[PDB]
Amino acid sequence: AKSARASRIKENHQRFKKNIAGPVEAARLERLSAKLMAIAQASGVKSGKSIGRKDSSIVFPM
Amino acid sequence: GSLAFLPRKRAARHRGRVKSFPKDDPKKPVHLTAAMGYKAGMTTIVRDLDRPGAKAHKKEVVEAVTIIDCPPMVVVGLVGYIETPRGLRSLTTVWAEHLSDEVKRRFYKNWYKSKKKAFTKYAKKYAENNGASITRELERIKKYCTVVRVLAHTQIRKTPLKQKKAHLMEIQINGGSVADKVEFGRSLFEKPVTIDTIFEKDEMIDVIAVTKGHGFVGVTARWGTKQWTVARAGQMGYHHRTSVNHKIYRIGKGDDEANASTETDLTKKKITPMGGFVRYGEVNNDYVMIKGSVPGVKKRIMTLRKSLFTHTSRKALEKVELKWIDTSSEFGHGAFQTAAEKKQFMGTLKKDLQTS
RNA sequence: GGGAUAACUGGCUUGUGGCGGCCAAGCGUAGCGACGUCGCUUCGGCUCUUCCUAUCAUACCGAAGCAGAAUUCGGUAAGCGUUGGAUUGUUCACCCACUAAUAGGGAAAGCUGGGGACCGUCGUGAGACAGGUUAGUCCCUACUGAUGAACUCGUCGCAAUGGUAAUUCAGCUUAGUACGAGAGGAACCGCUGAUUCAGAUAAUUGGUUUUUGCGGUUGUCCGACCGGGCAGUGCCGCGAAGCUACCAUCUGCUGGAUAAUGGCUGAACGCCUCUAAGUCAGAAUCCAUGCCAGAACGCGACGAUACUACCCGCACGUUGUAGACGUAUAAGAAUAGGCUCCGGCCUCGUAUCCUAGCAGGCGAUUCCUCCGCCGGCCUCGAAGUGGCCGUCGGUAAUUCGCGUAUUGCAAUUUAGACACGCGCGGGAUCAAAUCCUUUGCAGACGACUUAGAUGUGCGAAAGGGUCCUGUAAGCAGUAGAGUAGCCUUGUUGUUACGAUCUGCUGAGGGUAAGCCCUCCUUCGCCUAGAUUUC
RNA sequence: ACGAGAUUCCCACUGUCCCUAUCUACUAUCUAGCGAAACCACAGCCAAGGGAACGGGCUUGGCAAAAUCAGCGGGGAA
RNA sequence: CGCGGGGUUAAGGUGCCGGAGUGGACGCUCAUCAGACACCACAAAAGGCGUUAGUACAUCUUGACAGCAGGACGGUGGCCAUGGAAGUCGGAAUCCGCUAAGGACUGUGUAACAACUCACCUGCCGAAUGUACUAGCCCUGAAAAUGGAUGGCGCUCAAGCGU
């Protein structure tokens, strides 16, 4: 029989993932993301927009 | 035995880690990946099979399903990781204001005798015009990180468990730009996320949990007998396991009051068995009906995550139609689905007349 | 009886016989002479782990009158498997089947059945002897699991490294199609199961019963009844819970590079060539992902940190440093080319920068050059910094005046950076873990999941539900077989006892000990006490 | 005919086995008290090499982190 | 060969373990586990469309080797045999003409022909080629079974081989 890591089986699975399983899982993800979208939507230094410094080693201590 | 599970030692943690989230590309919409639930037990269902090419096609099949109690999770934080030549590294994490007592219990070993001040100074960061500090961390994640995760914790006061210390985990945010998912995580702060939003019906998931322990066991039951490759005695059970390809059969709402009802049987009943789930209690929240068996004992924390790859079987993307859900008692040879059905069968009793 | 000798083999072994003639490049100056051709023909069984390939099967290729089907020979391949019986008649020991197939060896090994040597005496054409003597040498480590000091305790993670997993068959469709005179008779794509292996799980079914839970019954006993004791759990039936069973159920996943081989463009070699430069595809192969563990001396993020001293400034240390003394210097890319200011330049870092002053003073003359600290705006995440502006401080580019002596003719020119500790004076904070009791998602002990401070708390009862058994004790009905008295005959005479049956009674009993719920169902307990910690 | 004689055949039964699972008591385990012996040059990781098919100490690699608890049987001539 | 100090060497070495040269000159070699001093066995008159040096013979402006464009004819389907057999299922002979040259034919092909192809010849092109041996270095020239060895890393105009 053909192994699970056979090249031919991978090619057939790749077509199945692209032509049958893909569209179905894409539609499922759209509905799920919409539900989570609904729940969620329900001076640089002084403002933090300028990302500054908060509060063993890699080099030899000179 | 198998040498792929060779270090048969007790799991380092009781919770179990995902160890792999599905690969992320920015094209898909923003979504979560994993969730937590508590194992309630098992029950029997009848399914109207629609498997073209099978012997049981257009026939009724009896199957065993497991029930996981899933109260909504609360999103209380956000974590960002960066890519390094040494792997993924946590750059910074941004916690939300107003954490609950349960999630603070996770941070303490002796909560009763402690002066509960975890995140007391962190709360002042939000409300004392140090919001620049909070935004600076949020902007740091946006412009340096490639993977953003959400810290969500369970609500075990809703669960019929004597434990009061909730469970934390990081759930990856997949499908979007790093900027998009950061705004996603910040908007989810202090908010409950229900299970029907993370997963849904007739989809196939993976479950991660720690198996039931057995203690010191000999070669006969440990390695299955009729150096590192020679069977020996030691710990059997309490091993971290990742089981894949388990189909969700139903997601119950808990507030429906007819969770166990189908379009075939018109009986207003919930999922809890007559007398309650044995050694667990009553499921009063959202629940996920998973086909077959799943690692872990009852009332054990259960980690549910998505499939790492697009499925290659017709077992996925196939509709699940239910005919009847068992609710009879698991404490014995039960024969009644509802308290009314028992009283109707046996008539009225001596105590019934004496009380009335 | 004496002499030499402990004994053998170790780049051993494997597929193609020997002898004679003919031919025969050479060597040689007759002799050796290969390939061919001719002539003559102790043993058996038992095993577990791993390895090898000299491959039986499964995968992929090359060839064959290989039409199809089934095959045969050969190549890469050890990833994955390699059975159940007979051994009861005969022999060179080998039949029966099942299966995809029923390949061969190494580690050379232990159990189990089959199947002694010296003298002495009496004799030797030859043996006999119950005549004597005698050898018979609970610890460390490895492996499997469990804890663990130091780094304040804890939470969430990363992933170096180590292991690694899936296998074979069948059925449906293609299709009674291609192919074939007929008989027969495929395959790719698609779909559904099953074998072996592996990891889990207890709804359901079966098994198990100290639930000693309920009931029945034997012997003996508590005077009888009730309720029970003993028979190391008397015996029997059911029996939850727990544990388990291919006796039950669920699940087992995808990228890159290759071997044999088939090709493209094209020299060698004016044809030609898959190979030389370049390059396409291609096996169950290889490497990784998915999966398991986590370095207890690998790392990251976050929370709270009581003292000690957490942060800041400077004051030093008779404090530690596999080893300061200008510890100065960023393009990228090619090497049969490159750089540029677009003029030109490139062997050459023997280059560029910085480089003077009591270990570097004081005062001038003169100069806007360089250095430093602080702020403001920004920028630096691969193990996180630099730029711009402003203030202040220092500052030979030129030239002087004052000072250096005495360390006595050299003696490390004690001078840097990091870390650690001791002190002041300014700001800031008022923490945890363990023991203990408890929990059973855990367990040999440690460890682990829990809970203990007012709460949806913990514990003990109780009520209800759900399950198990199978109808309690007692009372009553002439229902009742049967055993006896009263009077005299009874065609219906009465009075007592009366096993059993029926009703009260799906009753009574048990119910978490690893079942479920509690509206004030009742009662009680609480902000401890001990140790340690930056 | 007889025989705790042997063998074969027939019927019946069986955890012998397919293929194991469950249960009970005493141990194994932990604690209090009591408390030995065998044995002991010194030790104790693996690989290749160390002419005398001899290695445990040498060579040169793999490496290599305190202190412990339980299991086992791998190693210590003719 | 007494106990010490200084100097110089032998065998062996100077890429790092490791003290001393990534020393100098000219060449050779690319190995799918090269070689680094074992040179005995496997092992031969052995297989290599690997590479370099050499020896002998041979062809060449009278045009050599390779190629392209053409010829490759006639007696004659030679004789026997064969159902059929014409160069090409077989046996045996294998001559002559025209010639520039062309076999009573080297392969494909047909039932038999036909047709194609080779040998051989000519035109175009243009200068060096062919064969067989010898000597170096390289591949193969047979290997089982715990993971390991030029001592190890590693080394390719070498850190290999010869002087």
Automatic annotation (TrEMBL), chain A:
Positions in coiled-coil regions: none
Sequence segments annotated as region (Disordered): 1-20
GO cellular component, one term: preribosome, large subunit precursor
Pfam families named among the record's database cross-references: YBL028C_N
Residues of the DUF2423 domain: 1-42
PANTHER family tied to this protein: UPF0642 PROTEIN YBL028C
Protein's name according to its UniProt entry: DUF2423 domain-containing protein
Organism: Chaetomium thermophilum (strain DSM 1495 / CBS 144.50 / IMI 039719) (Thermochaetoides thermophila)
TrEMBL record, chain B:
One cellular component term from this protein's GO annotations in UniProt: cytosolic large ribosomal subunit
Keyword annotations of the record: Metal-binding, Ribonucleoprotein, Ribosomal protein
InterPro entries from the UniProt entry: L3_arc_euk (IPR045077), Ribosomal_L3_dom_3_arc_sf (IPR044892), Ribosomal_uL3 (IPR000597), Ribosomal_uL3_CS (IPR019926), Transl_B-barrel_sf (IPR009000)
The keyword Ribosomal protein appears for this protein: yes
Residues that hold Mg(2+) 3 according to the record: 330
Pfam families for this protein: Ribosomal_L3
SUPFAM superfamilies assigned: Translation proteins (SSF50447)
PANTHER family: 60S RIBOSOMAL PROTEIN L3-RELATED, LARGE RIBOSOMAL SUBUNIT PROTEIN UL3
Protein name (database record): Large ribosomal subunit protein uL3
Upper lineage: Eukaryota, Fungi, Dikarya, Ascomycota, Pezizomycotina
